[PDB]
Amino acid sequence: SHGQSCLGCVVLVSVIEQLAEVHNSSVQVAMERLCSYLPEKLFLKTACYFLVQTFGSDIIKLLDEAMKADVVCYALEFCKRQCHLYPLPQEAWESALEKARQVLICSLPFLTKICQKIELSIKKAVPFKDVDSDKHSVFPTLRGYHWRGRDCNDSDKTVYPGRRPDNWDIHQDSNCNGIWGIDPKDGIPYEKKFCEGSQPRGIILLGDAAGAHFHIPPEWLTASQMSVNSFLNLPSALTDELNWPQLSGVTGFLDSTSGIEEKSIYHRLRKRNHCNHRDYQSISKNGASSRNLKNFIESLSRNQASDHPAIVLYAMIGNDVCNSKADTVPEMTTPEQMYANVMQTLTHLNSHLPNGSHVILYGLPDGTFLWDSLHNRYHPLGQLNKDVTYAQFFSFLRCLQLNPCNGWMSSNKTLRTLTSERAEQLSNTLKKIATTETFANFDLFYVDFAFHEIIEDWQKRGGQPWQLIEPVDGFHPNEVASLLQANRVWEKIQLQWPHVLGKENPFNSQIEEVFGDQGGH
Numbered sequence: 001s002h003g004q005s006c007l008g009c010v011v012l013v014s015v016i017e018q019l020a021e022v023h024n025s026s027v028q029v030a031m032e033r034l035c036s037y038l039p040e041k042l043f044l045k046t047a048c049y050f051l052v053q054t055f056g057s058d059i060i061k062l063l064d065e066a067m068k069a070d071v072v073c074y075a076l077e078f079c080k081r082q083c084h085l086y087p088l089p090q091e092a093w094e095s096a097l098e099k100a101r102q103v104l105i106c107s108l109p110f111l112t113k114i115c116q117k118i119e120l121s122i123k124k125a126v127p128f129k130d131v132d133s134d135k136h137s138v139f140p141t142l143r144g145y146h147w148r149g150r151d152c153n154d155s156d157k158t159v160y161p162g163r164r165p166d167n168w169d170i171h172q173d174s175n176c177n178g179i180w181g182i183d184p185k186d187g188i189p190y191e192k193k194f195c196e197g198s199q200p201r202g203i204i205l206l207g208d209a210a211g212a213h214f215h216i217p218p219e220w221l222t223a224s225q226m227s228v229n230s231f232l233n234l235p236s237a238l239t240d241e242l243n244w245p246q247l248s249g250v251t252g253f254l255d256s257t258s259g260i261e262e263k264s265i266y267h268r269l270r271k272r273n274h275c276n277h278r279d280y281q282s283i284s285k286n287g288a289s290s291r292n293l294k295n296f297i298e299s300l301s302r303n304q305a306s307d308h309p310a311i312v313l314y315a316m317i318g319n320d321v322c323n324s325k326a327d328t329v330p331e332m333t334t335p336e337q338m339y340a341n342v343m344q345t346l347t348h349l350n351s352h353l354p355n356g357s358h359v360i361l362y363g364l365p366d367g368t369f370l371w372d373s374l375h376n377r378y379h380p381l382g383q384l385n386k387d388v389t390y391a392q393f394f395s396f397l398r399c400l401q402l403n404p405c406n407g408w409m410s411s412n413k414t415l416r417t418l419t420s421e422r423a424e425q426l427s428n429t430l431k432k433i434a435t436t437e438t439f440a441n442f443d444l445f446y447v448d449f450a451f452h453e454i455i456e457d458w459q460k461r462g463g464q465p466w467q468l469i470e471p472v473d474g475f476h477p478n479e480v481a482s483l484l485q486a487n488r489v490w491e492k493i494q495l496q497w498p499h500v501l502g503k504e505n506p507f508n509s510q511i512e513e514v515f516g517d518q519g520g521h
């Protein structure tokens with residue numbers, strides 16, 4: 001727990017220092033300026049002012065002595081001994097620390113219960129706001145409709161996206177796809193006329209942080225461009241666990257910020273058959289791996305008897321080789337364990353998916369890409385003064401036991417190579433499972449990651465490989481990379497296994513004519 005506290009202190013004190021530098025101001029003014037940028041929502045501004053009240057005068061004192069954020073946070077004891085973010089020799093650290101010494105909430109009784117209620121729903125990966133308990137929400141975050149189709153009736157547990165339509169939806173839109181009622185000419189229900197025989201299916205992601213599109217905007221950490229507008233998305237991002245599933249390559253339903261034209265798998269499936277409107281679920285968690293998926297897979301919502309079938313993407317693309325343990329190789333999953341873990345998941349899916357479903361296993365990428373692309377580039381926190389490379393950033397995180405992938409985010413080339421060998425072996429295990437293992441309620445397919453193909457296509461497009469990686473964590477594929485990978489999966493399945501995606505619905509135009517945007521998302 002010291003790790004996060006240390007990292008959080010070092011980030012905050014770094015922004016304060018750089019805001020002072022950028023604006024040529026006192027530290028007092030820089031702290032007031034940061035608080036002025038933060039929204040009131042989620043008590044962020046008030047928390048900022050509380051911190052300034054509590055620690056402001058000590059921060060002023062130490063930053064005035066020209067100590068950097070890492071030293072300050074040890075001195076204030078947010079960090080406990082020594083992890084260097086900024087380049088400074090050991091001798092200079094011992095100097096500064098002796099001089100520093102020389103120079104120098106859910107316990108609220110009315111919050112405890114709601115805090116536990118929120119921690120629980122997050123741990124179970126189910127929406128906190130869900131009156132009828134069908135796991136679909138009217139609220140966007142806290143596992144709400146950013147993560148799955150919005151509930152059109154939160155007072156009816158039999159109304160939710162992906163349901164087979166009750167009574168062809170004559171009187172209610174029971175599956176939230178915006179199609180319901182009867183044609184006045186022939187009295188035929190629109191959902192019957194427009195969706196019967198079209199074989200609707202949902203998209204379900206079983207994913208990790210990359211699949212849920214973990215993303216810390218570098219705008220939150222770069223003083224030179226910071227403003228009130230930088231942090232408007234901070235409350236919702238925090239209550240989404242710093243994930244942005246609504247923009248992900250598999251389950252995204254908002255229009256891309258990036259400016260590439262590639263669309264999510266959900267968007268493509270909705271476009272192929274508009275009856276699939278709102279039928280997405282991101283069953284994804286930061287840190288998810290083949291080993292621990294069983295701890296939250298029960299949050300998936302698909303009633304075997306009453307729901308349309310689904311396409312399920314199994315996308316554990318790294319945490320079976322990526323971990324934060326100093327001796328990192330012993331915690332990497334073995335091929336034999338991977339086989340046992342995946343078979344357990346598939347056996348579980350078989351008894352919880354409607355017949356006619358499809359499961360796609362994703363291979364693991366080769367992540368040596370991370371070090372090679374980034375190690376000599378400057379991290380957002382090092383860009384002002386050109387003093388924190390990604391190598392220094394990775395080393396700092398490793399010292400804090402917070403590096404999310406010690407095997408690849410490492411200056412040790414032999415270890416980077418070993419990690420890639422293991423990832424390939426695990427991908428080959430997934431491949432073999434898809435080729436040889438059969439289940440009653442779904443068929444099973446393998447698609448490799450093949451980031452070399454994505455990097456090549458990106459290079460043809462005029463891009464550089466470093467532009468495919470989240471700038472703040474230096475680890476996850478960013479929104480562009482995620483959409484490029486989803487496009488590759490879509491095309492490959494379209495070419496080899498077109499039945500997985502179904503046919504285009506010939507009534508799509510008539511659906512749009514009668515129902516417009518089908519209620520939106």
Ligand SMILES: CCCCCCCCCCCCCC(=O)OC[C@H](CO)OC(=O)CCCCCCCCCCCCC
Nearest residue numbers: 208209210286287288317318365367369404451473477481
């Ligand atoms: C581009 C494709 C080819 C190369 C890709 C390389 C392999 C990618 C594997 C991603 C697999 C997802 C693993 C995961 O869930 O992540 C898990 C970890 C934790 O277990 O996620 C994290 O928590 C990352 C945290 C890193 C810390 C960064 C600190 C940023 C400063 C904090 C400021 C925030 C203030 C609100």
Ligand SMILES: *[C@@H]1O[C@H](CO)[C@@H](O)[C@H](O)[C@H]1NC(C)=O
Nearest residue numbers: 152153154155156159172173
């Ligand atoms: C939602 O379902 C309930 C039935 O439990 C019904 O009373 C209510 O009218 C429904 N809402 C809409 C908009 O149909």
Ligand SMILES: *[C@@H]1O[C@H](CO)[C@@H](O)[C@H](O)[C@H]1NC(C)=O
Nearest residue numbers: 328329412413414415416418
């Ligand atoms: C680099 O990684 C390999 C593989 O784990 C290990 O044997 C070696 O000791 C590491 N080198 C250093 C300098 O730590």
Ligand SMILES: [Ca+2]
Nearest residue numbers: 153154156159
């Ligand atoms: Ca409902």
Ligand SMILES: [Ca+2]
Nearest residue numbers: 134136151154
């Ligand atoms: Ca609900």
Ligand SMILES: [Ca+2]
Nearest residue numbers: 169173175179
């Ligand atoms: Ca409907």
